[PDB]
Design a protein around this motif. Structure first.
Motif, PDB file in Angstrom:
ATOM      1  N   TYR A   1       0.981  -1.119  -0.125  1.00 54.75           N
ATOM      2  CA  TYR A   1      -0.007   0.085  -0.039  1.00 54.75           C
ATOM      3  C   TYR A   1       0.832   1.220  -0.213  1.00 54.75           C
ATOM      4  O   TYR A   1       0.483   2.117  -0.893  1.00 54.75           O
ATOM      5  CB  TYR A   1      -0.821   0.034   1.144  1.00 54.75           C
ATOM      6  N   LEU A   2       2.016   1.468   0.776  1.00 56.05           N
ATOM      7  CA  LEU A   2       2.853   2.532   0.928  1.00 56.05           C
ATOM      8  C   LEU A   2       3.378   2.515  -0.557  1.00 56.05           C
ATOM      9  O   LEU A   2       3.555   3.741  -0.984  1.00 56.05           O
ATOM     10  CB  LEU A   2       3.878   2.184   2.105  1.00 56.05           C
ATOM     11  N   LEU A   3       4.182   1.548  -1.064  1.00 56.87           N
ATOM     12  CA  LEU A   3       4.593   1.599  -2.399  1.00 56.87           C
ATOM     13  C   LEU A   3       3.738   2.323  -3.344  1.00 56.87           C
ATOM     14  O   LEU A   3       4.172   3.018  -4.131  1.00 56.87           O
ATOM     15  CB  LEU A   3       5.286   0.264  -2.865  1.00 56.87           C
TER      16      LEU A   3
ATOM     17  N   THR B   1      -4.445   6.752  -0.932  1.00 59.99           N
ATOM     18  CA  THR B   1      -3.551   7.008   0.078  1.00 59.99           C
ATOM     19  C   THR B   1      -4.457   7.354   1.321  1.00 59.99           C
ATOM     20  O   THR B   1      -4.113   7.910   2.444  1.00 59.99           O
ATOM     21  CB  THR B   1      -2.701   8.341  -0.197  1.00 59.99           C
ATOM     22  N   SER B   2      -5.561   7.138   1.472  1.00 56.24           N
ATOM     23  CA  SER B   2      -6.690   7.262   2.664  1.00 56.24           C
ATOM     24  C   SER B   2      -6.163   6.547   3.787  1.00 56.24           C
ATOM     25  O   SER B   2      -6.560   7.022   4.956  1.00 56.24           O
ATOM     26  CB  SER B   2      -8.169   6.999   2.060  1.00 56.24           C
ATOM     27  N   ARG B   3      -5.579   5.503   3.607  1.00 51.58           N
ATOM     28  CA  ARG B   3      -5.179   4.791   4.923  1.00 51.58           C
ATOM     29  C   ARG B   3      -3.814   4.919   5.540  1.00 51.58           C
ATOM     30  O   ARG B   3      -3.340   4.177   6.342  1.00 51.58           O
ATOM     31  CB  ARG B   3      -5.460   3.310   4.479  1.00 51.58           C
TER      32      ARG B   3
ATOM     33  N   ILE C   1      -2.231   3.694   8.925  1.00 49.82           N
ATOM     34  CA  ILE C   1      -0.910   3.119   8.986  1.00 49.82           C
ATOM     35  C   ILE C   1       0.003   3.758   9.950  1.00 49.82           C
ATOM     36  O   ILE C   1       0.885   3.179  10.817  1.00 49.82           O
ATOM     37  CB  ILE C   1      -0.157   2.880   7.552  1.00 49.82           C
ATOM     38  N   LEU C   2      -0.101   5.112   9.819  1.00 45.62           N
ATOM     39  CA  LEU C   2       0.883   6.182  10.689  1.00 45.62           C
ATOM     40  C   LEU C   2       0.580   5.688  12.041  1.00 45.62           C
ATOM     41  O   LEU C   2       1.521   5.582  13.109  1.00 45.62           O
ATOM     42  CB  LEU C   2       0.750   7.318  10.392  1.00 45.62           C
ATOM     43  N   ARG C   3      -0.654   6.015  12.459  1.00 45.37           N
ATOM     44  CA  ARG C   3      -1.080   6.031  13.891  1.00 45.37           C
ATOM     45  C   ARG C   3      -0.781   4.179  14.351  1.00 45.37           C
ATOM     46  O   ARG C   3      -0.375   4.051  15.639  1.00 45.37           O
ATOM     47  CB  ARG C   3      -2.757   5.875  14.122  1.00 45.37           C
TER      48      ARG C   3
END
Ligand SMILES: C[C@@H]1O[C@@H](O)[C@@H](O)[C@H](O[C@H]2O[C@H](C)[C@H](O)[C@H](O[C@@H]3O[C@H](CO)[C@@H](O)[C@H](O)[C@H]3O)[C@@H]2O)[C@@H]1O
Ligand SMILES: Nc1nc2c(ncn2[C@@H]2O[C@H](COP(=O)(O)O)[C@@H](O)[C@H]2O)c(=O)[nH]1
Length: 269
Positions: free
Chosen positions: A218-220, A229-231, A235-237
């Motif tokens: 997903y990040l890639l 990029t909504s998630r 992922i950050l939290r």
């Protein structure tokens, strides 16, 4: 020694290896060593390379375990202050080697240029934390690295048959190896996609072992513009507490999550 070493892995490159070598010998104003690492070509590849009896060319022809094995063999032998890797389907542009020598005199350990892929600029990314959730930020063949840089970072990891160059550069970033990007075309470039992606995701997990494979993918895709990029804030939290380097990477890559990065730095770092 030499200003430059060019390592050229070859296997059955008889069609283009002469043009590749010509692009290296045309470079003026630098003392250059050439190390051709051949994997046992049965075509005219060795007959062509030997046509270039430059007193600064070395031929290694022996079984290897893949291109990065061959690269490792050539880098190990490199006697030049800056070391570059040139595929046999690639060509250096004019003056690039003096441009590399110029930028190295200031102490930079890595000098990277632009890449021409089918008459288009490779969409490079910056050499910075945000690369660590992506692929290799600049074209591998547009990169030169000093003797010290390789001695610090190590060789290419043969577990990655495609993206071992990206893994090496990420190790460079993580090691604070100095890099100067030059906005000039260095090289003109001459594999199953699924395998490319699989290796890129695994390389990303090697920077951030807490990521599930789907999360690395997903990040890639988010960074490369291939997916949404909504998630990212999710992922950050989830993992922000793990690494300040990971928080730094996501906020650089996705400026939309700055306010959320602020919270991670504050509560955790
Ligand atoms: C499957 C994909 O098809 C196209 O979209 C292609 O543009 C994609 O390539 C891009 O993403 C992958 C991850 C690569 O990072 C590629 O860069 C190249 O990858 C190699 C991996 O280390 C380097 O050896 C190479 O020098 C570099 O140009 C590009 O960013 C992808 O194939
Ligand atoms: N030494 C060595 N070189 C290789 C091998 N496979 C590909 N190459 C060379 O590495 C470069 C990459 O080309 P590719 O085959 O990836 O398009 C070319 O110069 C090619 O001839 C290999 O197994 N061993």
């Amino acid at each position: 020694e030499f200003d430059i070493t060019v390592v050229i892995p070859t296997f059955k490159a008889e069609k283009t290896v002469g043009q590749c070598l010509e692009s290296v010998l045309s470079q003026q104003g630098v003392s250059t060593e050439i190390i051709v690492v051949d994997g046992g070509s049965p075509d005219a590849t060795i007959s062509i390379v030997q046509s270039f009896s430059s007193t600064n060319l070395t031929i290694i022809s022996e079984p290897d375990r893949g291109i990065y094995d061959a690269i490792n063999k050539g880098v190990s032998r490199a006697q030049g202050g800056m070391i570059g890797v040139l595929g046999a389907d690639d060509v250096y542009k004019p003056n690039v080697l003096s441009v590399v020598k110029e930028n190295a005199s200031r102490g930079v350990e890595i000098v990277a240029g632009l890449t021409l892929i089918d008459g288009q600029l490779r969409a490079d990314e910056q050499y910075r934390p945000a690369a660590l959730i992506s692929g290799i930020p600049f074209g591998h063949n547009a990169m030169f690295a000093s003797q010290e840089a390789y001695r610090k970072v190590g060789l290419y990891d043969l577990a990655y048959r495609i993206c071992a160059d990206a893994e090496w550069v990420h190790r460079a970033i993580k090691s604070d190896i100095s890099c100067r990007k030059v906005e000039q075309v260095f090289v003109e470039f001459g594999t199953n996609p699924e395998e490319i992606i699989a290796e890129a995701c695994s390389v990303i997990q090697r920077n951030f072992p807490f990521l599930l494979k789907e999360e690395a993918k997903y990040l890639l895709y988010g960074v490369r513009g291939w997916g949404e990029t909504s998630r990212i804030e999710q992922i950050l939290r989830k993992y922000g507490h793990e690494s300040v380097l990971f928080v730094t990477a996501l906020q650089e890559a996705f400026p939309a999550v700055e306010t959320a990065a602020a919270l991670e730095h504050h509560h955790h770092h």
